Amino acid sequence: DRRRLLGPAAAKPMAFEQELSLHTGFIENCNGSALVEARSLGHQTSLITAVYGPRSIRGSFTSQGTISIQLKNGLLEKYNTNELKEVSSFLMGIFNSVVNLSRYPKSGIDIFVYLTYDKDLTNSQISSLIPHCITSITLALADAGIELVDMAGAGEANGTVVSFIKNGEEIVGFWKDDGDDEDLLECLDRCKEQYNRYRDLMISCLMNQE
Amino acid sequence: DSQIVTPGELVTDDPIWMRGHGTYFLDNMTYSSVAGTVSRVNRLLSVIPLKGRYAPETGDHVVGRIAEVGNKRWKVDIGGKQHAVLMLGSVNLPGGILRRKSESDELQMRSFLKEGDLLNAEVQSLFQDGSASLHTRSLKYGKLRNGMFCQVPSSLIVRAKNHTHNLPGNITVVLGVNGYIWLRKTSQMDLARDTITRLEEESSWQIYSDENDPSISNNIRQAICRYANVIKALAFCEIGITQQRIVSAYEASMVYSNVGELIEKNVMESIGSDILTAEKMR
Amino acid sequence: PITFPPEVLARISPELSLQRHLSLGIRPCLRKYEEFRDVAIENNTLSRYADAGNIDTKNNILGSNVLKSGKTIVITSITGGIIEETSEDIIANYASVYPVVEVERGRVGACTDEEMTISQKLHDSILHSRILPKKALKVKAGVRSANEDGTFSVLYPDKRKWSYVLYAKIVVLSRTGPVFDLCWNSLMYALQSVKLPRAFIDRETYEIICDQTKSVPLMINAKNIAFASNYGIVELDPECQLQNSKLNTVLIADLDTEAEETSIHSTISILAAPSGNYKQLTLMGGGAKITPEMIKRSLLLSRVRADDLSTRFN
Amino acid sequence: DIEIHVLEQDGGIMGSLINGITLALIDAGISMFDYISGISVGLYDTTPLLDTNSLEENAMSTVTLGVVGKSEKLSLLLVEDKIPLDRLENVLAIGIAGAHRVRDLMDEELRKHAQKRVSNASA
Amino acid sequence: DDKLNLEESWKAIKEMNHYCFLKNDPDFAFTNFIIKDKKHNNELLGIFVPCNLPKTTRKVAIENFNRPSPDDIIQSAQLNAFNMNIFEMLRIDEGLRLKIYKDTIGIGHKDEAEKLFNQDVDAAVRGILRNAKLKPVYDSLDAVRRAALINMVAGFTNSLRNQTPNRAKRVITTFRTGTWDAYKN
Amino acid sequence: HMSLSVAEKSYLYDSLASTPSIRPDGRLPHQFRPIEIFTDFLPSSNGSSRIIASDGSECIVSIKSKVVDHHVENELLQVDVDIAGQRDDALVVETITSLLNKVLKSGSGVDSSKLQLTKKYSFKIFVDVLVISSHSHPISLISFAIYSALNSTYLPKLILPTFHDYDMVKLDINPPLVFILAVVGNNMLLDPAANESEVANNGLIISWSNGKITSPIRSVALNDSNVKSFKPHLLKQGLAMVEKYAPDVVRSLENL
Amino acid sequence: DSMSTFIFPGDSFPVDPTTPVKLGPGIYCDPNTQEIRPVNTGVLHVSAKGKVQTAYIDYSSKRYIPSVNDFVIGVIIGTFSDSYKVSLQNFSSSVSLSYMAFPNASKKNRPTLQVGDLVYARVCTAEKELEAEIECFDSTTGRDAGFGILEDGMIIDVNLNFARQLLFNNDFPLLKVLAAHTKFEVAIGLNGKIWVKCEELSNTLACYRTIMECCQKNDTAAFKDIAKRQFKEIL
Amino acid sequence: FQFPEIAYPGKLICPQYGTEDIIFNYVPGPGTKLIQYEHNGRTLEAITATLVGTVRCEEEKVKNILVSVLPGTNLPKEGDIVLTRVTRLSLQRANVEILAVEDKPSPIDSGIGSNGSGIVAAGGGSGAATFSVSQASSDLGETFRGIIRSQDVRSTDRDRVKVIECFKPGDIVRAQVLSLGDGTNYYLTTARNDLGVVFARAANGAGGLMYATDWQMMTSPVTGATEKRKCAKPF
Ligand code: NA
Ligand code: NA
């Protein structure tokens, strides 16, 4: 690498239900920002989002806003690039359903999600991580002053992530990747309860903070 | 029919001929630059390619899509080698001739035509590169509504006096010479191709409205689907598209009560051969 | 009476904003001339050896540091590797780390001039300040001998050579000004927390493998550990001075808030050791005349800042 | 824009690319002065071998030729491994000839495809 | 009748908008870590005003900016000239004198009562811009064809293709020559 | 196709959301468009397939194999996707790649035991996809091509492992199918056309194996213009629709 | 004054303070300090007087910067709606040449210049905020002023000092030693471009070679010799 | 009922209409949107806040009312006042870059220090050469670009406006957005008393700051010299 100090090439790498804290507007060089930390028994996570935008776009005139979402591995290179981009695409769909894009012609909104910390002491963790991503992105978008038709929420149960809006009446996101086979309804119910709690916490955070 | 020639082939050693497209020459020797048929029209010798993009000609009636909004002009996709241009002063503004040039309407060009809008237009003139300059000043030209778009190769569009036709089932077809085709609900303007009409003409105060007729019956929609499918069927059989062949395709397709059936290969071929046979027998 | 918020004033006329603030004895970052930003540190929280009782198996982080100054956050993580070696205070016998600085600003893509120069200067300054001797990176290979016949145990001394190679990933959130100092200090604390994993072995060659739990202290020369300071020299323009109802220059410490970064072109940066010696000095007279007095005050402030940063924790 | 996908490879792939381009460009109705025929010739000791496969391309030096139409003029001349100068010309001699044959083949297809699709389009 | 009553709608709004507020905020030493721990002059957040500058010259500047801008001068001039041109036109085609009227007060309704004329004229403008058909062409017409159109301003419309002997010649010619020339003589 | 005018979008949407839905070509909600498939045309590969759709979408799949130690390579099936006009860095390409890799994971995507040669060695399956042309989400297209390619895949026969020189054994496995659905209003559509996908409220990616609705299942925005939320009963509708109209796709693909 | 003196950027300006001095190239008036400071390395040049003396610094330069009343040789690189896009030097910012900027020119009667044509023009406008403008006519009367197309010649790249010396200094022997051998047409462009055309291609080539070789050599007296050896038509 | 005063995304403010007497028609302004929600198997048309802040329902000319949401207790739109920096000048137009929209800097990070130690443009460093167009909207310091045509400078005398006497490179100009324009440029105007140059430096950005003295003139305090601009009226 000509743009980085990677050191010697001869060298080889060394081989050998949950509480929530939500805060916004602590990053000064972007429009929106959100810190989300989650603590369940024998499992702790924490991630940060940053919304840069509405910014200018290269290319032809666009009739509406263009949202980009970038997942960044924090600390450990925990996940595959392909899976990260897949989740990114999923979230893009969700917030394409949520953000009021009509308000932002010829404009781009770039969202960055840093996965700083993800250590669960229990001895495919993407699924359990997605709802917190959605929480943080909704919080950061609301913090950036980016218009949202609703507060995008989500829940996870049995490898099934479901993202809701409108008091859980309708679905903006559905992610199911193995994680065993169970009937759909109770996963829906559990994820909806998680969604409602997360929603309450997010509005609360948006009323004590903004 | 005609002499089939390939690139680099000697067409004639005679220097008398003028030389059109598909040819190049060295002294008296004339060679072909494409694969196609030799064409002799008066003193003009040329070679017509078997395949090629739509080449716009002055006076052509085309359907196009707004690709770009620019400075005092629109860039429209016709399906040719280059984007056509549509000058601001080459369109009709909402109203009578009376309104003079404004800077304001130049600033709100997007209200008349925006990126994505389909329009019916005429090729006024050609630039040096061969790209088309367009105009929409006639009342029959403008933004297209109340229907569906489909397309065929431009070569399959046989030409006539008109390219906007009234078809049974109350559906008007707009056959662009570039192969771009619009299928719409027949309007009162469309109805008036016989031989309070003035109020009718003025009623289209909005020729840049993005709203459809609030009343489009399921019958008209089904018929739109059927016309689309049979036009695509004629295209698949490489049959030249004409009004009569379209209505004949429609009627012949009425055999299949479900319009979906028209998307299968053997059905398309059957409709095609039905039309050709019927044409040869008459 | 037309009015601009401090933010947009810093965008529109940085020089005017800076001068105007300085006319009141303050700065656009709301600190006075020689007032540093406070710093807060979470050390060795990301390392695998963070908890001696329950060592994280999946983790590969040898060292950790989380620094916060003003509103800027710097996260530094030290990973490692091993290279097979081939074949005094002089520079030849010293080593450095290989840092990758990632300053979080709006863009995505390859490294900016900022990131590249900060990385390289971190490397070079680690090398020249002589904080890390090559000898300390030497691996003492134990050997894995088989229990009787039936499994395996490893024996370490209380036959080729090998060397440790340290890598640093440094991410910077909420950048408001020059961030090299923060990166340096963060990397210093991080280096102090590094623990080197013990290593053992079994035209053909066998791989060396690190022990899962055992680790020895990365012995760095604490004498040579310096801390970073930066200063701006501003020339006061008589017309932009507020009424506050013949040329002057002022010294400014710990630059921030864009107005300062955009306006100030005369800068000093120091790596100073608590002992009294200096590890690095950079003078750039792009604007105002850099006088000896300014240099001396800068060295003084750098040394008190160094004592401060070295003492404030533990 | 020319978009090429090599699905299968067995040596002499450059000339193949050339031929594919010629065919596709002619099919597009895009005007050009003549055919360009691509061929490869290997040199085994004293004797040249026409249109080399993968096994022949290894353990042997090869020359790739891009010949314009029926002419002796070369659009492309590619030699990537060492060849005795005094034997190079000979290698070209057969190569050109081979390329000519290739032209005759491509031509032979086009005409047919023409003759077929100009007769059926009629009525 | 899928629609809901306004009262039912307000209800439904009250039930949808319901959420569970919670005053206090929820260990988490990292969040705490990231979230830890004058200027009454207002002369600093304004346009550059030189410290040197004397008060008199400041008064000069403020004075200069209190006087109308060149745009204002030309605009008001063009408006006044417009008013007297449209009165002079309407006068040439509709007589002027006071207090008696014979059907077929001065200008088609003290000659300071010209204000009333203006009052009338604006109404036409007020009346013209409102209806949506006309607004583009009036917006696009220059002062004199604009004047001819005001002159014309329900069933009078004839598709563009108290009284005067000759107005047709005068007004229509004015409408597509775009000059006051016919009126001048 | 793509970049329709607002008028066109309104017309198409109104037809597709009416009851019953009127599709631009008159298809039933569960009806597919005519496609044709060719196999066994790439001799160098262990398997091969080519699929052509009526709208022009064309895809090519190659099946190759190599011996690997399970212990060093836990993944015995790798899908590499190459879409023309799209860089390998592209978001959609890596998304499709990840998805396909998950549908075909040796874990439970397909039966890993069918690949085993020896307790230390096996065949790794390299599935190479080349999308020549696509006007809609090519996930079903690719899935079908891969199905055909795997159902006509032959591998060298075992006798360090040594193999028969001329005789080869047909790879026996039940490859999964991935279906794509368009959610338009209250209507579910199978095999969405480009114009249909331009106005669709949302989308459903639903995997399918041995006659069962299996994972992965995704909600996917077929565009960025009209992405709206949907009710759960629609999801149930989509699942039911797939498991109702999947065995006929399976019997159509598996009849040679 | 009359004595020209070598000078470096940053050196103290040595002219009379009480005497008014109009400042040419090389001399910079600092916008903040209002100090008169030299910014170019070369020879300081003070004209006698008149009404005020001109102080300028002649310095070696290869890159042309447009200034009004300069005679330049450009090449047409683009055609616009009401103007030509012209290049006075490769990699430099282009210059505008109005369609109206020609003799006997109206909106109906347009000039017949194509992309790739040589134009000999006068820099009429050289604002520091705007793109430079050239002209091919007398701006006052509107008739031909010896400007226009240059056909079938050969162009020669040359440093600015050489060109200025060629246009203004009549004691410069290059033109004279060239005239000694053949008849030729020459256009001198202060942008560092010299256009030459002879009746015979051989002679034009000879002119090209000898002009370039003369350009590379600092000594002036050598020219004649060079010309000789060059017009002896060696290969 | 009374409209709630605090607002968050997804919160419903009021139905489409209301009678209290006359029938107020509710128009979805900035921060709100008219969404048709579904409740009890039946339709409800409601104005929904899309932002966090205080809702406002103010009244402008059976009678409809503007419902919006203001943050506290962006993107250039038509009619918005933007503060710009003059980047280019030409006889026809003035190119500017939007630095702030309605007392809000855009972008939030200008990219200072990204390119090194000198004075470098937003994309004048190494980062600009390696920017991923595929994965991001724009580069670090990239700004919305705008154009002030010569016609759109003044309200009157629009035919013969000299932009060189109105703006200079580096000037900070207060403008209003006429049109969205194209992908590259917004179209702006200064044709109002409060619109125009709000900041300027003598010698085209090189000298010290000048202050506005008259509608068409600023002057430098240290030099006393006057320069011609189109000054936006302070206070
Ligand atoms: Na956009
Ligand atoms: Na050939």
Curated annotation (Swiss-Prot), chain C:
Non-catalytic component of the RNA exosome complex which has 3'->5' exoribonuclease activity and participates in a multitude of cellular RNA processing and degradation events. In the nucleus, the RNA exosome complex is involved in proper maturation of stable RNA species such as rRNA, snRNA and snoRNA, in the elimination of RNA processing by-products and non-coding 'pervasive' transcripts, such as antisense RNA species and cryptic unstable transcripts (CUTs), and of mRNAs with processing defects, thereby limiting or excluding their export to the cytoplasm. The modification Phosphoserine is found at S13. CDD domains: RNase_PH. One of its GO terms (molecular function) is mRNA 3'-UTR AU-rich region binding. The keyword Repressor does not apply. Its main location: cytoplasm. Changing A199T: Interaction with RRP46 abolished. Present with 3180 molecules/cell in log phase SD medium. This is Exosome complex component RRP43. It comes from Saccharomyces cerevisiae (strain ATCC 204508 / S288c) (Baker's yeast). One of its GO terms (biological process) is mRNA processing. It is found in: Cytoplasm; Nucleus, Nucleolus.
From Swiss-Prot, chain D:
One of its GO terms (cellular component) is cytoplasmic exosome (RNase complex). The keyword Nucleus applies. The keyword Nucleus applies. GO terms for biological process: exonucleolytic trimming to generate mature 3'-end of 5.8S rRNA from tricistronic rRNA transcript (SSU-rRNA, 5.8S rRNA, LSU-rRNA); nuclear mRNA surveillance; nuclear polyadenylation-dependent CUT catabolic process; nuclear-transcribed mRNA catabolic process; nuclear-transcribed mRNA catabolic process, 3'-5' exonucleolytic nonsense-mediated decay; poly(A)-dependent snoRNA 3'-end processing; RNA catabolic process; RNA processing. Keywords: Cytoplasm, Exosome, Nucleus, RNA-binding, rRNA processing. It is found in: Cytoplasm; Nucleus, Nucleolus. GO terms for molecular function: RNA binding. Its main location: cytoplasm. Component of the RNA exosome complex. Specifically part of the catalytically inactive RNA exosome core complex (Exo-9) which may associate with the catalytic subunits RRP6 and DIS3 in cytoplasmic- and nuclear-specific RNA exosome complex forms. Exo-9 is formed by a hexameric base ring of RNase PH domain-containing subunits and a cap ring consisting of CSL4, RRP4 and RRP40. Belongs to the RNase PH family. Present with 5150 molecules/cell in log phase SD medium. This is Exosome complex component SKI6. It comes from Saccharomyces cerevisiae (strain ATCC 204508 / S288c) (Baker's yeast).
UniProtKB/Swiss-Prot annotation, chain G:
Its main location: cytoplasm. Residues 67-137 form the S1 motif domain. GO terms for molecular function: manganese ion binding; RNA binding. GO terms for cellular component: cytoplasmic exosome (RNase complex); exosome (RNase complex); nuclear exosome (RNase complex); nucleolus; nucleus. One of its GO terms (biological process) is RNA processing. It is found in: Cytoplasm; Nucleus, Nucleolus. Coiled coil: none annotated. Keywords: Cytoplasm, Exosome, Nucleus, RNA-binding, rRNA processing. SUPFAM superfamilies: Eukaryotic type KH-domain (KH-domain type I), Nucleic acid-binding proteins. InterPro entries: Exosome_RNA_bind1/RRP40/RRP4, KH_dom_type_1, KH_dom_type_1_sf, NA-bd_OB-fold, RRP40_KH-I, Rrp40_N_euk, Rrp40_S1. Component of the RNA exosome complex. Specifically part of the catalytically inactive RNA exosome core complex (Exo-9) which may associate with the catalytic subunits RRP6 and DIS3 in cytoplasmic- and nuclear-specific RNA exosome complex forms. Exo-9 is formed by a hexameric base ring of RNase PH domain-containing subunits and a cap ring consisting of CSL4, RRP4 and RRP40. Belongs to the RRP40 family. This is Exosome complex component RRP40.
UniProtKB/Swiss-Prot annotation, chain H:
GO terms for molecular function: RNA binding. Keywords: Cytoplasm, Exosome, Nucleus, Phosphoprotein, RNA-binding, rRNA processing. InterPro entries: Csl4 (IPR039771), CSL4_N (IPR048626), EXOSC1_C (IPR019495), NA-bd_OB-fold (IPR012340). It is found in: Cytoplasm; Nucleus, Nucleolus. One of its GO terms (biological process) is TRAMP-dependent tRNA surveillance pathway. It holds the Pfam family CSL4_N. It comes from the Eukaryota. Its main location: cytoplasm. Present with 5550 molecules/cell in log phase SD medium. Belongs to the CSL4 family. This is Exosome complex component CSL4. The lineage of its organism: Eukaryota, Fungi, Dikarya, Ascomycota, Saccharomycotina.
